Amino acid sequence: NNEKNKDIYSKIKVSDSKPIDESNLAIYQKIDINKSEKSMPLYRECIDV
RNA sequence: ACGAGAACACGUAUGCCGAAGUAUAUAAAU
């Protein structure tokens, strides 16, 4: 419940990621999973499985 | 025919001689 997590935010440091080669990149369609699976108009580049 | 008349307070040398605008302290926490 934000245990002053604004404070601890400074004391834990995360580096950026190392490179990810292309063979692990894919294009996917955004799908609205619901009672009837819908399809969003646009697509995305995202990391593969 | 004036206790008068003549007589450069002159001539030599300079502000020097050594020193550091120096001493640490993240353009920072989303």
Automatic annotation (TrEMBL):
It comes from the Bacteria. This subunit might be involved in maturation of a crRNA intermediate to its mature form. Belongs to the CRISPR-associated Csm5 family. This is CRISPR system Cms protein Csm5.
